[PDB]
Design a binder for this molecule. Structure first.
Ligand SMILES: *[B-](O)(O)CNC(=O)c1c(F)cccc1F
Ligand SMILES: *[B-](O)(O)CNC(=O)c1c(F)cccc1F
Ligand SMILES: [Cl-]
Ligand SMILES: [Cl-]
Ligand SMILES: [Cl-]
Ligand SMILES: [Cl-]
Ligand SMILES: [Cl-]
Ligand SMILES: [Cl-]
Ligand SMILES: [Cl-]
Ligand SMILES: [Cl-]
Ligand SMILES: [Cl-]
Ligand SMILES: [Cl-]
Ligand SMILES: [Cl-]
Ligand SMILES: [Cl-]
Ligand SMILES: [Cl-]
Ligand SMILES: [Cl-]
Ligand SMILES: [Cl-]
Ligand SMILES: [Cl-]
Ligand SMILES: [Cl-]
Ligand SMILES: [Cl-]
Ligand SMILES: [Cl-]
Ligand SMILES: [Cl-]
Ligand SMILES: [Cl-]
Ligand SMILES: [Cl-]
Ligand SMILES: [Cl-]
Ligand SMILES: [Cl-]
Ligand SMILES: [Cl-]
Ligand SMILES: [Cl-]
Ligand SMILES: [Cl-]
Ligand SMILES: [Cl-]
Ligand SMILES: [Cl-]
Ligand SMILES: [Cl-]
Ligand SMILES: [Cl-]
Ligand SMILES: [Cl-]
Ligand SMILES: [Cl-]
Ligand code: NA
Ligand code: NA
Lengths: 469, 469
């Protein structure tokens, strides 16, 4: 029995992450095969005695048999990923103790996993941080569950305005971001580049208000969220994900909105060639192409702006020609710096990244902004050196079907009269193209122009807007 | 034109709360009458120009006409309520500035409002704190939205056990109560008497898990809650209510589960006797009688235990014979002592009570426990002196249909073997009657016995339980 890379080169016959991860998935596939083959009903398969016998059966069936398990893993790439974490993993240590890590590199067109990083060192710690451990995705939830959906429902567009004025959770506590209680109105791009929380809160509220099927979106991408009624959901509250699953969500946006399920096994077959298992592809249009490519545009600037990650500086210095590939991405940060994420894509690959501590104590303030950003730049450069064409040179581009409205920079809506405490006002001033994913684009400017805001908020907002005309 | 008390005695012809409150409701009733009479379609009634003309019409129609508006108000009672707040209202001032107040006294069998208190003094402050201002009900939400429903769905019973171990909101913050992060397991009665938050959190979660129609319950009682997906809902988060509306919810539990809509107007009629308006009664069985009378039992002890209110001590001293009537009740307290409530019933009346500040700054720590408790005791004694039989001498009593199970005091479930990390254990020790509102009563003891709790929680819990056998 052997496990091979994707070219058939043997990984091992039946002591690191690659081996145990591929062996485990293979055993799962063997278990279904065997239940079926023996005509075990999904009823009798609910007995835990029979389950356990079939799992041991599937294990021995691999040890003893002459099976050929074909993984998606790319051997040059996955080795380079291992060398990189061995050489540069110390760069994650931020003086809060040893920092753990997981990464998963995914082909955007197939869902196939090319290489991953399970942790700093299997021999010192076995936990698989790429495939098993589950942590809040934090703000990398935003592009998926809040803004992406709002755009796909045609409820906002790329230059739409949101409230980031102070507001509280229903319990009375203020919604914090770092240690800021909020500012004022802002565009979607500034909310994204900075990653503020209040714009996201208000976005999910608007989704709820319009009864949007938010679950439907998330389940099409294989996310399991037990409870959607949670004020902080769009910031990562009440969600817990593997790096492998989460990469798959960023693969959806990368791939112009088309989900392909993740996999590390493509095929199992007996020595005589019987196909015991075969990955069956199953594409799903989760976001409209308009949505996904507008979103790519915004995420490009998350990395260019360098607000919450230094990544592009780090990569520019290691590999300027690679830094000019069309990178997009989003960071995340939990409320006490327990977890940092960085999600990266080009049109070809998505690289997912998490760091944190196995027991969930805090990292330093900058573990995400700087350390993980620097580590990942090294990791990305290692992958490129090992396979020079793999990230590709293609550009993300707006899909023909995107609609483009002309809007006021200050309302993110079309100019036109509006009512302010008595008189109608000629709503005027500098303008910008906004990208929408509906039929009509952006609407007439109306008073409640932003996503969110209280009466005083708008009183203050409209005061400022007026004195500029 | 005149407004009368319920005996026909004239209040006024067309300068305090009584006048403006009764005039306002009467004008609303006149508006519907007139729209109808003139054959104005609910379409044309959506025009705000026509709305405004009909509201001015309805106002002049009262000034000019010879209408006889019959209120539910009891004249002796409502006067005594006004004297009481004038004499004793200074008892609310807790050194956080002038404290405002509202109360509403409701007949449990009719919904009729007998008397209310709009504030400390109309001449100094017009705001109607009984009928217009809206504030979180805080923990007085619990009996209605969390425990009452759980019991009515047959998901818990009176001695059922809940977790009050530490746990966080989905955002990472711990659920606080005063400045405690939690303790351990506890019975429903201790959770109620103390008013802890974590047992309620876990209760609403279990309701959500079983897809219970919680909205259905709350809307039958006339509550408008815009969003049910809120972790703190059962503690008062995301709800805002008048004292009049909230009294009506406590009227539902008082009246063995049968809602009657609140009203201050019973009848409007023209000089020649034409009935322009008549209150039409509309009873609804919101909770089963089993639920409502079990709940009465628990709420009796909220006041007897004197944990979160001194009320019974205060009343015992002013009027011991009245203190022996069968009082039940619940306090509430917002997260920064912005609002205090006390809800009181006997089988005949429900008295609702709020205090706080018009601008929502904090009250002192004890404004609810002590000051409002003392004020209300005075208010209740004033009402009794003015109408001696009005609170009545009846007892709340368990309804025949309540089921009574024998359960272990420590699991609040029936004794029987259970699995603890290996061996099966003879689950034993002292016992208690638990009251249920289903067909079967309490179930077999199983491992996850409490409402809520994490794996460690139960590890700790079961450790303690074991070493006692
Ligand atoms: B983001 O990581 O920049 C901001 N997100 C948050 O503050 C957040 C979490 F990461 C997780 C739960 C709640 C929350 F607000
Ligand atoms: B109760 O008033 O004793 C406890 N309730 C609360 O802590 C609470 C509120 F009153 C309002 C919102 C949230 C919350 F936890
Ligand atoms: Cl490995
Ligand atoms: Cl592993
Ligand atoms: Cl390979
Ligand atoms: Cl909070
Ligand atoms: Cl949903
Ligand atoms: Cl998931
Ligand atoms: Cl929901
Ligand atoms: Cl797989
Ligand atoms: Cl074979
Ligand atoms: Cl499309
Ligand atoms: Cl750049
Ligand atoms: Cl930088
Ligand atoms: Cl650790
Ligand atoms: Cl346009
Ligand atoms: Cl503008
Ligand atoms: Cl532009
Ligand atoms: Cl449209
Ligand atoms: Cl009055
Ligand atoms: Cl009034
Ligand atoms: Cl009267
Ligand atoms: Cl509901
Ligand atoms: Cl309401
Ligand atoms: Cl809901
Ligand atoms: Cl009324
Ligand atoms: Cl008449
Ligand atoms: Cl009933
Ligand atoms: Cl008592
Ligand atoms: Cl006392
Ligand atoms: Cl005030
Ligand atoms: Cl029994
Ligand atoms: Cl016991
Ligand atoms: Cl007993
Ligand atoms: Cl039953
Ligand atoms: Na972030
Ligand atoms: Na309380």
């Amino acid at each position: 029995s052997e496990i091979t890379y994707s070219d058939g080169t043997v990984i091992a016959s039946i002591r690191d992450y690659l081996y145990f991860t591929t062996l485990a998935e293979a055993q799962e596939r063997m278990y279904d095969y065997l239940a079926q083959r023996d005509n075990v009903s999904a009823k009798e398969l609910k007995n835990e005695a029979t389950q356990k016998f079939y799992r041991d059966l599937a294990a021995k069936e691999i040890e003893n048999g002459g099976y050929k398990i074909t993984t998606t893993i790319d051997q040059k790439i996955h080795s380079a990923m291992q060398s990189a974490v061995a050489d540069y993993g110390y760069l994650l240590d931020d003086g809060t103790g040893r920092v753990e890590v997981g990464n998963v590199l995914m082909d955007n067109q197939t869902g196939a996993i090319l290489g991953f990083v399970g942790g700093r060192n299997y021999q010192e710690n076995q936990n698989n941080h790429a495939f098993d451990t589950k942590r809040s995705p934090a703000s990398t939830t935003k592009p998926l569950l809040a803004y992406g959906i709002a755009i796909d429902q045609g409820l906002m567009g790329s230059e739409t305005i949101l409230s980031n004025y102070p507001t509280n959770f229903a319990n009375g506590n203020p919604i914090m971001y770092a240690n800021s209680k909020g500012t004022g109105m802002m565009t979607l791009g500034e909310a994204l580049n900075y990653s503020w929380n209040i714009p996201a809160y208000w976005t999910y509220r608007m989704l709820r208000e319009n009864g949007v099927d938010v679950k439907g979106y998330m389940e099409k991408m294989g996310y399991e969220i037990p409870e959607y009624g949670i004020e902080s959901l769009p910031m990562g509250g009440g969600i817990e994900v593997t790096v492998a699953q989460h990469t798959n969500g960023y693969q959806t946006l990368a791939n112009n909105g088309v989900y392909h399920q993740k996999h590390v096994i493509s095929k199992i077959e007996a020595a005589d060639g019987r196909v015991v298992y075969e990955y069956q592809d199953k594409p799903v249009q989760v976001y409209s192409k308009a949505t996904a490519t507008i979103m790519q545009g915004l995420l490009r600037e998350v990395l260019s702006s360098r607000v919450t990650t230094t990544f592009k500086s780090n990569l520019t210095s290691l590999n300027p020609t690679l830094a000019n590939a069309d990178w997009i991405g989003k960071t995340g940060t939990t409320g006490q710096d327990e977890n940092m994420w960085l999600m990266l894509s080009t049109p070809r690959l998505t690289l997912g990244g998490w760091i944190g501590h196995d027991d969930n104590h805090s990292l330093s303030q900058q573990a995400g902004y700087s350390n993980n950003s620097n580590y990942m730049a090294h990791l990305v450069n290692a992958i490129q050196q090992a396979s020079p064409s793999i990230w590709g040179n293609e550009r993300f581009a707006l899909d023909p079907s995107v609609v483009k409205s002309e809007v006021l920079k200050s309302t993110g809506q079309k100019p036109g009269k509006v009512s302010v405490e008595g008189k109608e006002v000629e709503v005027t001033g500098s303008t910008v193209t906004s990208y929408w994913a509906n039929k009509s684009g952006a609407p007439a400017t109306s008073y409640r122009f932003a996503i969110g805001g209280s009466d005083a908020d708008y009183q203050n907002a409209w005061s400022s807007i007026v004195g500029s005309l």
